[PDB]
Amino acid sequence: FNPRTDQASAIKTKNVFIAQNVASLQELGGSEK
Amino acid sequence: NHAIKLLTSLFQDLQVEALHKGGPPAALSIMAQSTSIQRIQRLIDSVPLMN
Known part of the structure; x- marks a missing residue:
């Protein structure tokens, strides 16, 4: 996994999580669905 | 740097x-609409890219 970018660390983690979800959606082509 | 960007x-x-994984080379023109792949x-x- 590539991050591809302590109080803001959680935000970064959330950002990473968000990006991952978006990526998965695109992989699934769920956007079109 | 600019080329990389x-x-x-x-x-x-x-x-x-x-x-979800889904022509001739793009012409050198502003209006030369083509596929992103082209x-x-x-x-x-034009140039060995990876190299």
Whole structure:
């Protein structure tokens, strides 16, 4: 996994999580669905 | 630096195009509308890109 970018660390983690979800959606082509 | 940034942007649009993994090289014109793949194809044809 590539991050591809302590109080803001959680935000970064959330950002990473968000990006991952978006990526998965695109992989699934769920956007079109 | 500028060339690297432009390459990044073009390849990222090529990925937006090959959603779920889915011609001649792009002509050198502002109105030369082509597939994102053809644009990258032109760059690869012009200069060994990875090398």
